[PDB]
Amino acid sequence: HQPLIARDGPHPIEQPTHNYMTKIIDRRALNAAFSLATEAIALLTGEAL
Amino acid sequence: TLDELESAPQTTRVRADLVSIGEKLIFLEALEKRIYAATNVPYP
């Protein structure tokens, strides 16, 4: 909402202006690598216990 | 057709700026953020 000041002539008269803005979300993602090994499944599961 | 002014003191505190120059205190403000911010008006 724009404020106004009031002038005289000869240059013209202004009205109140208004503005309505819309902005779209920009979307991203991330990644990570956790990878395990061969035996480590069976060492957690209990095959080699 | 002759009429005289009537004035009443109602003082309030106002944030401002005071500068001492020479022998008298001098007022100093810039008038950009208070007035003329985001208009189409040139600064005279």
Coordinates of all heavy atoms in Angstrom, one line a residue:
Chain A
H1 N 0.8 -1.2 0.0 CA 0.0 0.0 0.0 C 0.9 1.2 0.0 O 1.7 1.4 0.9 CB -0.9 0.0 1.2 CG -1.8 -1.2 1.3 ND1 -3.0 -1.2 0.6 CD2 -1.7 -2.4 1.9 CE1 -3.6 -2.4 0.8 NE2 -2.8 -3.1 1.6
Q2 N 0.8 2.1 -1.0 CA 1.6 3.2 -1.2 C 1.1 4.4 -0.6 O -0.1 4.8 -0.7 CB 1.9 3.5 -2.7 CG 2.7 2.4 -3.3 CD 3.0 2.7 -4.8 OE1 2.5 3.6 -5.4 NE2 3.8 1.8 -5.4
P3 N 1.9 5.2 0.2 CA 1.4 6.4 0.8 C 1.5 7.5 -0.3 O 2.1 7.4 -1.3 CB 2.4 6.7 1.9 CG 3.6 6.0 1.5 CD 3.2 4.8 0.7
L4 N 0.7 8.6 0.0 CA 0.6 9.7 -1.0 C 0.9 11.0 -0.3 O 0.6 11.1 0.9 CB -0.9 9.8 -1.6 CG -1.2 8.9 -2.8 CD1 -1.3 7.5 -2.4 CD2 -2.5 9.4 -3.4
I5 N 1.4 12.0 -1.0 CA 1.4 13.4 -0.6 C 0.6 14.2 -1.6 O 0.4 13.7 -2.8 CB 2.8 13.9 -0.5 CG1 3.6 14.0 -1.8 CG2 3.7 13.0 0.3 CD1 3.6 15.4 -2.4
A6 N 0.0 15.3 -1.2 CA -0.9 16.1 -2.0 C -0.2 17.3 -2.6 O 0.4 18.1 -1.8 CB -2.1 16.5 -1.2
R7 N -0.2 17.4 -3.9 CA 0.4 18.6 -4.5 C -0.7 19.5 -5.1 O -1.9 19.2 -5.0 CB 1.3 18.2 -5.7 CG 2.5 17.5 -5.3 CD 3.5 17.4 -6.4 NE 2.9 16.7 -7.6 CZ 3.0 15.4 -7.8 NH1 3.8 14.7 -7.0 NH2 2.5 14.9 -8.9
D8 N -0.3 20.7 -5.6 CA -1.1 21.6 -6.3 C -1.1 21.4 -7.8 O -0.6 20.3 -8.2 CB -0.6 23.1 -6.0 CG -0.8 23.4 -4.5 OD1 -1.6 22.8 -3.8 OD2 -0.1 24.3 -4.1
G9 N -1.6 22.3 -8.5 CA -1.4 22.3 -10.0 C 0.0 22.9 -10.4 O 0.8 23.2 -9.5
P10 N 0.2 23.0 -11.7 CA -0.7 22.6 -12.8 C -0.5 21.1 -13.1 O -1.4 20.5 -13.8 CB -0.2 23.4 -14.0 CG 1.3 23.6 -13.7 CD 1.4 23.7 -12.2
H11 N 0.5 20.4 -12.6 CA 0.7 19.0 -12.9 C -0.2 18.1 -12.1 O -0.5 18.5 -10.9 CB 2.2 18.7 -12.7 CG 2.8 19.0 -11.4 ND1 3.0 20.3 -11.0 CD2 3.1 18.2 -10.4 CE1 3.5 20.3 -9.7 NE2 3.6 19.0 -9.3
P12 N -0.6 17.0 -12.6 CA -2.0 16.5 -12.2 C -2.1 15.9 -10.9 O -1.1 15.8 -10.1 CB -2.2 15.5 -13.3 CG -0.9 14.9 -13.6 CD 0.0 16.1 -13.6
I13 N -3.3 15.4 -10.6 CA -3.6 14.8 -9.3 C -3.4 13.3 -9.3 O -3.8 12.6 -10.3 CB -5.1 15.2 -9.0 CG1 -5.3 16.7 -9.2 CG2 -5.4 14.8 -7.6 CD1 -6.7 17.1 -9.2
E14 N -2.9 12.7 -8.3 CA -2.7 11.3 -8.1 C -3.8 10.7 -7.2 O -4.3 11.4 -6.3 CB -1.3 11.0 -7.6 CG -1.0 11.5 -6.2 CD 0.4 11.2 -5.8 OE1 1.1 10.6 -6.6 OE2 0.7 11.4 -4.6
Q15 N -4.1 9.4 -7.5 CA -5.0 8.6 -6.7 C -4.2 7.6 -5.9 O -3.0 7.4 -6.2 CB -5.9 7.8 -7.7 CG -6.9 8.6 -8.4 CD -7.8 7.8 -9.3 OE1 -7.7 6.6 -9.4 NE2 -8.8 8.5 -9.9
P16 N -4.8 7.0 -4.8 CA -4.1 5.9 -4.1 C -4.0 4.7 -5.0 O -4.9 4.2 -5.6 CB -4.9 5.7 -2.9 CG -6.3 6.2 -3.2 CD -6.0 7.4 -4.1
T17 N -2.7 4.1 -5.0 CA -2.4 2.9 -5.8 C -2.3 1.8 -4.8 O -2.1 1.9 -3.6 CB -1.1 3.1 -6.5 OG1 0.0 3.3 -5.5 CG2 -1.2 4.3 -7.4
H18 N -2.5 0.6 -5.3 CA -2.3 -0.6 -4.5 C -1.7 -1.7 -5.3 O -1.7 -1.7 -6.5 CB -3.7 -1.2 -4.0 CG -4.5 -0.2 -3.2 ND1 -4.1 0.1 -1.9 CD2 -5.5 0.6 -3.5 CE1 -5.0 1.0 -1.4 NE2 -5.8 1.3 -2.3
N19 N -1.0 -2.6 -4.6 CA -0.2 -3.7 -5.3 C -0.5 -5.0 -4.6 O -0.6 -5.1 -3.4 CB 1.3 -3.4 -5.2 CG 1.6 -2.1 -6.1 OD1 1.1 -2.0 -7.2 ND2 2.5 -1.3 -5.5
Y20 N -0.6 -6.0 -5.4 CA -0.9 -7.4 -4.9 C 0.1 -8.4 -5.5 O 0.0 -8.6 -6.7 CB -2.3 -7.8 -5.1 CG -3.3 -6.9 -4.4 CD1 -3.9 -5.8 -5.0 CD2 -3.7 -7.2 -3.1 CE1 -4.8 -5.1 -4.3 CE2 -4.6 -6.4 -2.4 CZ -5.2 -5.4 -3.0 OH -6.1 -4.6 -2.4
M21 N 1.0 -8.9 -4.7 CA 2.1 -9.7 -5.2 C 1.9 -11.2 -4.9 O 1.4 -11.6 -3.8 CB 3.4 -9.3 -4.7 CG 3.9 -7.9 -5.2 SD 4.2 -7.9 -6.9 CE 5.7 -8.9 -7.0
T22 N 2.2 -12.1 -5.9 CA 2.2 -13.5 -5.7 C 3.5 -14.1 -6.0 O 4.1 -13.8 -7.1 CB 1.1 -14.2 -6.6 OG1 1.4 -13.9 -8.0 CG2 -0.3 -13.6 -6.2
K23 N 4.1 -14.9 -5.1 CA 5.4 -15.6 -5.3 C 5.2 -17.1 -5.1 O 4.6 -17.5 -4.2 CB 6.4 -15.0 -4.4 CG 6.8 -13.6 -4.7 CD 7.9 -13.2 -3.7 CE 8.4 -11.8 -3.9 NZ 9.4 -11.3 -3.0
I24 N 5.8 -17.8 -6.0 CA 5.6 -19.3 -6.0 C 6.8 -19.9 -5.3 O 7.9 -19.4 -5.3 CB 5.6 -19.8 -7.5 CG1 4.4 -19.2 -8.2 CG2 5.5 -21.3 -7.5 CD1 4.4 -19.5 -9.7
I25 N 6.5 -20.9 -4.5 CA 7.6 -21.6 -3.8 C 8.5 -22.3 -4.8 O 8.1 -23.0 -5.7 CB 7.0 -22.7 -2.8 CG1 6.0 -22.1 -1.8 CG2 8.1 -23.4 -2.1 CD1 5.3 -23.1 -1.0
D26 N 9.8 -22.1 -4.6 CA 10.9 -22.8 -5.3 C 11.3 -24.0 -4.5 O 11.6 -23.8 -3.3 CB 12.1 -21.9 -5.6 CG 13.1 -22.5 -6.5 OD1 12.8 -22.7 -7.7 OD2 14.1 -22.9 -6.0
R27 N 11.3 -25.2 -5.1 CA 11.4 -26.4 -4.4 C 12.7 -27.2 -4.7 O 13.0 -27.3 -5.9 CB 10.2 -27.3 -4.6 CG 10.2 -28.6 -3.8 CD 8.9 -29.3 -4.1 NE 7.7 -28.5 -3.6 CZ 6.5 -28.7 -3.9 NH1 6.1 -29.7 -4.6 NH2 5.5 -27.9 -3.4
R28 N 13.4 -27.7 -3.7 CA 14.6 -28.4 -3.9 C 14.6 -29.6 -3.0 O 13.7 -29.8 -2.2 CB 15.9 -27.6 -3.7 CG 16.1 -26.5 -4.7 CD 17.4 -25.7 -4.5 NE 17.5 -24.6 -5.5 CZ 18.5 -23.7 -5.5 NH1 19.4 -23.8 -4.5 NH2 18.6 -22.8 -6.4
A29 N 15.7 -30.5 -3.2 CA 15.8 -31.7 -2.4 C 17.3 -31.9 -2.1 O 18.2 -31.2 -2.6 CB 15.2 -32.9 -3.1
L30 N 17.6 -32.9 -1.2 CA 18.9 -33.2 -0.8 C 19.1 -34.8 -0.9 O 18.2 -35.5 -1.1 CB 19.3 -32.7 0.5 CG 19.7 -31.3 0.6 CD1 19.9 -30.8 2.0 CD2 21.0 -31.0 -0.3
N31 N 20.4 -35.2 -0.7 CA 20.8 -36.6 -0.9 C 21.9 -36.9 0.1 O 22.7 -36.0 0.5 CB 21.3 -36.8 -2.3 CG 20.1 -36.8 -3.3 OD1 19.1 -37.4 -3.1 ND2 20.4 -36.1 -4.4
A32 N 22.0 -38.2 0.5 CA 23.1 -38.7 1.3 C 23.2 -40.2 1.1 O 22.3 -40.9 0.9 CB 22.8 -38.4 2.8
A33 N 24.5 -40.6 1.2 CA 24.8 -42.0 1.0 C 25.3 -42.6 2.3 O 26.2 -42.1 2.9 CB 25.9 -42.1 -0.1
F34 N 24.6 -43.7 2.7 CA 24.8 -44.3 4.0 C 25.5 -45.7 4.0 O 25.9 -46.2 5.0 CB 23.4 -44.4 4.7 CG 23.4 -44.9 6.1 CD1 23.8 -44.0 7.1 CD2 23.1 -46.2 6.4 CE1 23.8 -44.4 8.4 CE2 23.1 -46.6 7.7 CZ 23.5 -45.7 8.7
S35 N 25.8 -46.1 2.8 CA 25.8 -47.6 2.4 C 26.7 -48.4 3.4 O 27.7 -48.1 3.8 CB 26.4 -47.7 1.0 OG 27.8 -47.2 1.0
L36 N 26.1 -49.6 3.6 CA 26.7 -50.6 4.5 C 27.5 -51.6 3.6 O 27.8 -51.4 2.4 CB 25.7 -51.4 5.3 CG 24.9 -50.5 6.3 CD1 23.8 -51.3 7.0 CD2 25.9 -50.0 7.3
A37 N 28.0 -52.7 4.2 CA 28.8 -53.7 3.6 C 28.1 -55.1 3.6 O 26.9 -55.2 3.8 CB 30.2 -53.9 4.4
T38 N 28.9 -56.1 3.2 CA 28.3 -57.4 3.0 C 27.9 -58.1 4.3 O 26.8 -58.5 4.5 CB 29.2 -58.3 2.1 OG1 30.4 -58.6 2.9 CG2 29.7 -57.5 0.9
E39 N 28.9 -58.3 5.1 CA 28.7 -59.1 6.4 C 27.9 -58.3 7.4 O 27.2 -59.0 8.2 CB 30.1 -59.4 7.1 CG 30.9 -60.5 6.4 CD 32.2 -60.8 7.2 OE1 32.5 -59.9 8.1 OE2 32.8 -61.8 7.0
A40 N 27.8 -57.0 7.3 CA 27.3 -56.1 8.4 C 25.8 -56.3 8.5 O 25.2 -56.0 9.6 CB 27.6 -54.7 8.1
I41 N 25.1 -56.8 7.5 CA 23.7 -57.2 7.6 C 23.6 -58.4 8.6 O 22.8 -58.4 9.5 CB 23.1 -57.6 6.2 CG1 23.1 -56.3 5.3 CG2 21.6 -58.0 6.4 CD1 22.8 -56.7 3.9
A42 N 24.4 -59.5 8.3 CA 24.3 -60.7 9.1 C 24.9 -60.5 10.5 O 24.5 -61.3 11.4 CB 25.0 -61.8 8.3
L43 N 25.7 -59.5 10.7 CA 26.2 -59.2 12.0 C 25.2 -58.5 12.8 O 25.3 -58.5 14.1 CB 27.5 -58.4 11.9 CG 28.6 -59.2 11.1 CD1 29.9 -58.3 11.0 CD2 28.9 -60.5 11.7
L44 N 24.2 -57.8 12.2 CA 23.1 -57.2 12.8 C 21.9 -58.1 12.9 O 21.2 -58.0 13.9 CB 22.7 -55.9 12.1 CG 23.7 -54.7 12.2 CD1 23.2 -53.6 11.2 CD2 23.8 -54.2 13.6
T45 N 21.7 -58.9 11.9 CA 20.6 -59.8 11.9 C 20.7 -61.0 12.9 O 19.8 -61.2 13.7 CB 20.3 -60.4 10.5 OG1 20.2 -59.3 9.6 CG2 19.1 -61.2 10.5
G46 N 21.9 -61.6 12.9 CA 22.1 -62.7 13.8 C 22.5 -64.0 13.1 O 22.4 -65.1 13.8
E47 N 22.9 -64.0 11.8 CA 23.2 -65.2 11.1 C 24.6 -65.7 11.6 O 24.8 -66.9 11.8 CB 23.3 -64.9 9.6 CG 21.9 -64.7 9.0 CD 22.0 -64.4 7.5 OE1 23.1 -64.4 7.0 OE2 20.9 -64.3 6.9
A48 N 25.5 -64.8 11.9 CA 26.9 -65.2 12.3 C 27.0 -65.2 13.8 O 28.1 -65.4 14.3 CB 27.9 -64.3 11.7
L49 N 25.9 -65.0 14.6 CA 26.0 -65.1 16.0 C 26.2 -66.5 16.5 O 25.5 -67.4 16.1 CB 24.8 -64.5 16.7 CG 24.7 -63.0 16.6 CD1 23.4 -62.5 17.2 CD2 25.9 -62.3 17.2
Chain B
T1 N -14.1 42.2 11.7 CA -13.2 41.7 10.7 C -11.8 41.5 11.2 O -10.9 41.2 10.5 CB -13.2 42.5 9.4 OG1 -12.7 43.8 9.7 CG2 -14.6 42.7 8.9
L2 N -11.6 41.8 12.5 CA -10.3 41.7 13.2 C -10.4 40.6 14.3 O -11.3 40.7 15.2 CB -9.9 43.0 13.8 CG -9.7 44.1 12.8 CD1 -9.4 45.4 13.5 CD2 -8.5 43.8 11.9
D3 N -9.6 39.6 14.2 CA -9.6 38.4 15.0 C -8.3 37.9 15.4 O -7.3 37.9 14.6 CB -10.4 37.3 14.3 CG -10.0 37.1 12.8 OD1 -9.2 38.0 12.3 OD2 -10.5 36.2 12.2
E4 N -8.1 37.4 16.6 CA -6.9 37.1 17.2 C -6.8 35.6 17.5 O -7.8 34.9 17.8 CB -6.7 37.9 18.5 CG -5.4 37.8 19.3 CD -4.2 38.3 18.5 OE1 -4.4 39.3 17.7 OE2 -3.1 37.8 18.7
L5 N -5.5 35.0 17.5 CA -5.3 33.6 17.6 C -5.4 33.2 19.1 O -5.1 34.0 20.0 CB -3.9 33.2 17.1 CG -3.9 33.3 15.6 CD1 -2.4 33.2 15.1 CD2 -4.7 32.2 15.0
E6 N -5.9 32.0 19.3 CA -5.9 31.3 20.6 C -5.0 30.1 20.6 O -5.3 29.2 19.7 CB -7.3 31.0 21.0 CG -8.2 32.2 21.2 CD -8.9 32.7 20.0 OE1 -8.6 32.0 18.9 OE2 -9.6 33.7 20.0
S7 N -4.1 29.9 21.5 CA -3.1 28.8 21.5 C -3.1 28.2 22.9 O -3.2 28.9 23.9 CB -1.7 29.3 21.0 OG -1.2 30.2 22.0
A8 N -2.9 26.9 22.9 CA -2.9 26.2 24.2 C -1.7 25.2 24.2 O -1.5 24.5 23.2 CB -4.2 25.4 24.4
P9 N -0.9 25.2 25.3 CA 0.3 24.3 25.3 C -0.1 22.9 25.7 O -0.6 22.6 26.8 CB 1.2 25.0 26.3 CG 0.2 25.8 27.2 CD -0.9 26.2 26.3
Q10 N 0.2 21.9 24.8 CA 0.1 20.5 25.1 C 1.3 19.9 24.6 O 1.4 19.4 23.4 CB -1.2 19.9 24.5 CG -2.5 20.4 25.1 CD -3.7 19.8 24.5 OE1 -3.6 19.0 23.6 NE2 -4.9 20.1 25.1
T11 N 2.4 19.8 25.4 CA 3.7 19.3 24.9 C 3.8 17.8 25.0 O 3.3 17.2 25.9 CB 4.8 19.9 25.8 OG1 4.6 19.5 27.1 CG2 4.7 21.5 25.7
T12 N 4.4 17.2 24.0 CA 4.7 15.8 23.9 C 6.2 15.6 23.6 O 6.8 16.5 22.9 CB 3.9 15.1 22.9 OG1 4.0 15.7 21.6 CG2 2.4 15.1 23.3
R13 N 6.8 14.5 24.0 CA 8.1 14.2 23.7 C 8.2 13.6 22.2 O 7.4 12.8 21.8 CB 8.7 13.2 24.6 CG 8.8 13.7 26.1 CD 9.9 14.8 26.1 NE 10.0 15.4 27.5 CZ 10.8 14.9 28.4 NH1 11.5 13.9 28.2 NH2 10.8 15.5 29.6
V14 N 9.2 14.0 21.5 CA 9.4 13.6 20.1 C 10.8 13.3 19.9 O 11.7 14.0 20.2 CB 8.9 14.8 19.1 CG1 9.3 14.4 17.7 CG2 7.4 15.0 19.2
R15 N 11.0 12.1 19.3 CA 12.3 11.6 18.9 C 12.8 12.5 17.7 O 12.1 12.7 16.7 CB 12.3 10.2 18.4 CG 12.1 9.2 19.6 CD 12.2 7.8 19.0 NE 11.9 6.8 20.0 CZ 11.8 5.5 19.8 NH1 12.0 5.0 18.5 NH2 11.6 4.6 20.7
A16 N 14.0 13.1 17.9 CA 14.5 14.1 17.0 C 16.0 14.1 17.1 O 16.6 13.3 17.7 CB 13.8 15.4 17.2
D17 N 16.6 15.2 16.5 CA 18.1 15.4 16.5 C 18.3 16.8 16.8 O 17.7 17.7 16.2 CB 18.7 15.0 15.2 CG 18.7 13.5 14.9 OD1 18.8 12.7 15.9 OD2 18.5 13.1 13.7
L18 N 19.3 17.1 17.7 CA 19.7 18.4 18.1 C 21.2 18.6 17.9 O 22.0 17.7 18.4 CB 19.3 18.7 19.6 CG 17.8 18.8 19.9 CD1 17.6 19.0 21.4 CD2 17.2 19.9 19.1
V19 N 21.6 19.7 17.3 CA 23.0 20.0 17.0 C 23.3 21.3 17.5 O 22.5 22.3 17.3 CB 23.3 19.9 15.5 CG1 24.7 20.3 15.2 CG2 23.0 18.5 14.9
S20 N 24.4 21.4 18.3 CA 24.9 22.7 18.8 C 25.8 23.3 17.8 O 26.9 22.8 17.6 CB 25.5 22.5 20.2 OG 26.7 21.8 20.0
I21 N 25.5 24.5 17.2 CA 26.3 25.2 16.3 C 26.4 26.6 16.8 O 25.5 27.4 16.8 CB 25.8 25.1 14.9 CG1 25.8 23.7 14.3 CG2 26.6 26.0 14.0 CD1 25.1 23.6 13.0
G22 N 27.7 27.0 17.1 CA 27.9 28.4 17.6 C 27.3 28.7 18.9 O 27.7 28.2 19.9
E23 N 26.3 29.5 18.9 CA 25.6 30.0 20.1 C 24.2 29.6 20.2 O 23.5 30.1 21.1 CB 25.7 31.6 20.1 CG 27.1 32.1 20.2 CD 27.2 33.6 20.2 OE1 26.2 34.2 20.0 OE2 28.3 34.2 20.5
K24 N 23.7 28.8 19.3 CA 22.2 28.4 19.3 C 22.1 27.0 18.9 O 22.8 26.5 18.0 CB 21.4 29.4 18.4 CG 21.9 29.5 17.0 CD 21.0 30.4 16.2 CE 21.5 30.5 14.7 NZ 20.6 31.5 14.0
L25 N 21.1 26.3 19.5 CA 20.8 24.9 19.2 C 20.1 24.8 17.8 O 19.1 25.6 17.6 CB 20.0 24.2 20.3 CG 20.8 24.1 21.6 CD1 19.9 23.4 22.6 CD2 22.1 23.4 21.4
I26 N 20.5 23.9 17.0 CA 20.0 23.9 15.6 C 19.4 22.5 15.4 O 20.0 21.5 15.7 CB 21.1 24.2 14.6 CG1 21.7 25.6 14.9 CG2 20.6 24.2 13.2 CD1 20.7 26.7 14.8
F27 N 18.2 22.5 14.7 CA 17.5 21.3 14.4 C 18.0 20.7 13.1 O 18.3 21.5 12.2 CB 16.0 21.5 14.4 CG 15.1 20.3 14.3 CD1 14.8 19.6 15.5 CD2 14.7 19.8 13.1 CE1 14.1 18.5 15.4 CE2 13.9 18.7 13.0 CZ 13.6 18.0 14.2
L28 N 18.0 19.4 13.0 CA 18.5 18.7 11.8 C 17.8 17.4 11.5 O 18.0 16.4 12.3 CB 20.0 18.5 12.0 CG 20.8 17.7 10.9 CD1 20.7 18.4 9.6 CD2 22.2 17.5 11.3
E29 N 17.0 17.3 10.5 CA 16.5 16.1 10.0 C 16.5 16.0 8.5 O 16.7 17.0 7.8 CB 15.0 15.8 10.5 CG 14.9 15.4 12.0 CD 13.5 15.0 12.4 OE1 12.6 15.2 11.6 OE2 13.4 14.4 13.5
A30 N 16.3 14.8 7.9 CA 16.7 14.6 6.6 C 15.5 14.5 5.6 O 15.6 14.8 4.4 CB 17.5 13.3 6.5
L31 N 14.3 13.9 6.1 CA 13.1 13.8 5.4 C 13.2 12.9 4.2 O 13.0 13.4 3.0 CB 12.5 15.1 5.0 CG 12.0 16.1 6.1 CD1 11.6 17.4 5.5 CD2 10.9 15.5 6.9
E32 N 13.6 11.7 4.4 CA 13.5 10.7 3.3 C 12.6 9.5 3.8 O 11.7 9.1 3.0 CB 14.9 10.2 2.9 CG 15.7 11.2 2.2 CD 15.1 11.6 0.9 OE1 14.6 10.8 0.2 OE2 15.2 12.8 0.5
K33 N 12.9 9.0 5.0 CA 12.1 7.9 5.5 C 10.7 8.3 6.0 O 9.8 7.6 5.9 CB 12.9 7.1 6.5 CG 14.1 6.4 6.0 CD 13.8 5.4 5.0 CE 13.1 4.2 5.6 NZ 12.8 3.1 4.6
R34 N 10.7 9.5 6.6 CA 9.4 10.0 7.1 C 8.5 10.4 6.0 O 7.3 10.0 6.0 CB 9.7 11.2 8.1 CG 10.6 10.8 9.2 CD 9.9 10.0 10.3 NE 10.8 9.7 11.4 CZ 10.9 10.4 12.5 NH1 10.2 11.5 12.6 NH2 11.7 10.1 13.5
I35 N 8.9 11.2 5.1 CA 8.1 11.8 4.0 C 8.9 11.5 2.7 O 10.1 11.5 2.7 CB 7.8 13.3 4.2 CG1 6.8 13.5 5.4 CG2 7.2 14.0 3.0 CD1 7.4 13.8 6.7
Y36 N 8.2 11.2 1.6 CA 8.6 10.9 0.2 C 9.1 9.5 0.0 O 9.5 9.2 -1.0 CB 9.6 11.9 -0.3 CG 9.1 13.4 -0.4 CD1 10.0 14.4 -0.3 CD2 7.8 13.7 -0.5 CE1 9.6 15.7 -0.3 CE2 7.4 15.0 -0.6 CZ 8.3 16.0 -0.5 OH 7.9 17.3 -0.6
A37 N 9.0 8.7 1.1 CA 9.3 7.3 0.9 C 8.3 6.6 0.0 O 7.1 6.6 0.4 CB 9.5 6.6 2.3
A38 N 8.7 6.0 -1.1 CA 7.9 5.2 -2.0 C 6.7 6.0 -2.5 O 5.6 5.6 -2.4 CB 7.5 3.9 -1.4
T39 N 7.0 7.1 -3.2 CA 6.0 7.9 -3.9 C 6.6 8.1 -5.3 O 7.7 7.6 -5.6 CB 5.7 9.2 -3.3 OG1 6.9 10.0 -3.1 CG2 5.1 9.0 -1.9
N40 N 5.9 8.9 -6.1 CA 6.4 9.3 -7.4 C 6.9 10.7 -7.4 O 7.0 11.4 -8.4 CB 5.3 9.2 -8.5 CG 5.0 7.7 -8.9 OD1 6.0 6.9 -9.1 ND2 3.8 7.4 -9.1
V41 N 7.2 11.3 -6.2 CA 7.4 12.7 -6.0 C 8.9 12.9 -6.0 O 9.6 12.3 -5.2 CB 6.7 13.2 -4.8 CG1 6.8 14.7 -4.7 CG2 5.3 12.7 -4.8
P42 N 9.4 13.9 -6.7 CA 10.9 14.3 -6.5 C 11.1 15.0 -5.2 O 10.2 15.6 -4.7 CB 11.1 15.2 -7.7 CG 9.8 15.8 -8.1 CD 8.8 14.7 -7.8
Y43 N 12.3 14.9 -4.7 CA 12.7 15.6 -3.5 C 13.2 17.0 -3.8 O 14.3 17.1 -4.4 CB 13.8 14.7 -2.8 CG 14.2 15.2 -1.4 CD1 13.4 15.2 -0.4 CD2 15.6 15.5 -1.2 CE1 13.8 15.6 0.9 CE2 16.0 15.9 0.0 CZ 15.1 16.0 1.1 OH 15.5 16.4 2.3
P44 N 12.5 18.0 -3.4 CA 12.8 19.3 -3.9 C 14.0 20.0 -3.4 O 14.5 20.9 -4.0 CB 11.5 20.2 -3.4 CG 11.1 19.5 -2.2 CD 11.4 18.0 -2.4

